Amino acid sequence: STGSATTTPIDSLDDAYITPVQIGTPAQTLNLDFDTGSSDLWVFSSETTASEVDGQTIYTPSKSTTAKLLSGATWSISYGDGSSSSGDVYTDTVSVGGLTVTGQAVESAKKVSSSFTEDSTIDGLLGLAFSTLNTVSPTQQKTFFDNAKASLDSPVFTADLGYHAPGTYNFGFIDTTAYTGSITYTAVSTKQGFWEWTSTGYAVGSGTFKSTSIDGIADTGTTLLYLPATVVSAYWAQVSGAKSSSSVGGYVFPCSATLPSFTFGVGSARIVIPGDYIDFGPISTGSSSCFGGIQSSAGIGINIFGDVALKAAFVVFNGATTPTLGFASK
């Protein structure tokens, strides 16, 4: 089997991407944030505290003839940005782009933190990291990809995120018309539950490439590119007027600037992030200070290849017995 679904930016900055997902019988379609940095499929629901729902589409398990309460199971998750959610668990039929899993754990939110409430465009998350990170207790549950893997033509999914435009998540096949050149594959460590890999270095603009190992995670659920402070300082030093602002919470730059590109290494191959992809716009409405798309990871504990980096590439998440990642230009 295979599946193919279009993923669409939620706003004009590409802050996140939503992909329609069918849950239950008859289908209830919710727009979920596919997140290769987490491993829970959770939804706004008829159980979510009413004051914490503000425009999202909800899953109502009582209207699904295939929903079953997973007795005793609860979940609770906290994300790198400080947001959180928690609730109970149903199993139900879940389809993505024509690919159907029966018995998928659908984690129904009883509580969500303010940032989820305030984002009316995201109806929940669909985790695509390794199932060892799934938070369901007392019986940990499998991701959608883990459940589908054996049925797929090939045990892979691909992320093809657009810049200010729709893109595609495919399951079970690699669309050879979706990228240019060849795909370079690189080793993955699953020890932390992430799609964790080691970039071979970087370049700023037309500068020379610096060979240096940068361990980090391929995370579709993080907006920006978070890298060591040395690397980030070298990038922003090429932008007149750029500075790190403690009050804003990162590097800012004059909105009048033209940003240089940023290149990262994948083995001997190179992925070029155009400068425009690094512009996240005014820090507040009407400001001439703009927020940068490359930021320091020094306070995180891990480097994160988020959407800024991933949307410059066609990315293969290879879930074979020894997982690997593949990157191609496009």
Side-chain angles (χ1 to χ4, degrees), residues 156-173:
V156 304
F157 68 93
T158 66
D160 180 8
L161 303 177
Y163 169 66
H164 296 170
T168 305
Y169 282 101
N170 292 327
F171 293 83
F173 73 104

Side-chain angles (χ1 to χ4, degrees), residues 24-62 64-67 69-109 112-141 143-148 150-190 192-242 244-294:
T25 307
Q28 301 179 38
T29 299
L30 275 66
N31 294 328
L32 306 186
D33 183 352
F34 283 23
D35 182 12
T36 64
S38 69
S39 306
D40 286 50
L41 192 177
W42 74 260
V43 297
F44 278 80
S45 75
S46 61
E47 302 181 329
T48 308
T49 299
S51 67
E52 296 179 351
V53 184
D54 185 5
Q56 295 80 13
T57 295
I58 64 171
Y59 169 61
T60 304
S62 66
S64 171
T65 60
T66 44
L69 178 72
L70 187 63
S71 186
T74 59
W75 62 280
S76 180
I77 192 160
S78 305
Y79 296 102
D81 67 357
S83 66
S84 62
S85 51
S86 62
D88 55 17
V89 188
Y90 293 83
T91 56
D92 209 339
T93 302
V94 172
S95 300
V96 174
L99 169 66
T100 300
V101 168
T102 57
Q104 176 65 42
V106 178
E107 300 171 35
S108 169
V112 304
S113 66
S114 57
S115 68
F116 290 114
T117 301
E118 292 161 2
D119 183 3
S120 67
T121 72
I122 291 176
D123 301 327
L125 268 63
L126 189 149
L128 296 166
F130 293 90
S131 294
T132 53
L133 294 179
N134 177 266
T135 78
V136 175
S137 179
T139 308
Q140 187 172 64
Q141 300 294 301
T143 70
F144 174 84
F145 177 55
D146 222 330
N147 280 323
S151 303
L152 297 178
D153 291 357
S154 184
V156 304
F157 68 93
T158 66
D160 180 8
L161 303 177
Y163 169 66
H164 296 170
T168 305
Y169 282 101
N170 292 327
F171 293 83
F173 73 104
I174 289 164
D175 180 356
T176 62
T177 73
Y179 58 88
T180 64
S182 56
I183 306 180
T184 298
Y185 289 85
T186 198
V188 164
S189 171
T190 65
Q192 295 190 90
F194 298 122
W195 293 91
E196 186 169 1
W197 65 289
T198 302
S199 174
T200 50
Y202 69 99
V204 176
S206 57
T208 61
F209 186 84
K210 173 74 167 178
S211 293
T212 183
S213 294
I214 303 168
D215 181 291
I217 66 167
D219 184 2
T220 60
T222 291
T223 311
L224 306 185
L225 174 52
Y226 293 88
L227 292 172
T230 51
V231 180
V232 175
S233 184
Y235 178 82
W236 290 108
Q238 297 304 310
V239 179
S240 286
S244 181
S245 166
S246 56
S247 65
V248 178
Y251 280 90
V252 297
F253 67 95
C255 293
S256 58
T258 306
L259 297 175
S261 63
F262 184 88
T263 301
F264 65 94
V266 183
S268 54
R270 307 286 178 256
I271 299 293
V272 179
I273 304 170
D276 286 353
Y277 290 26
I278 299 161
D279 183 355
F280 279 75
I283 59 170
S284 295
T285 305
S287 177
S288 73
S289 184
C290 274
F291 196 68
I294 294 175

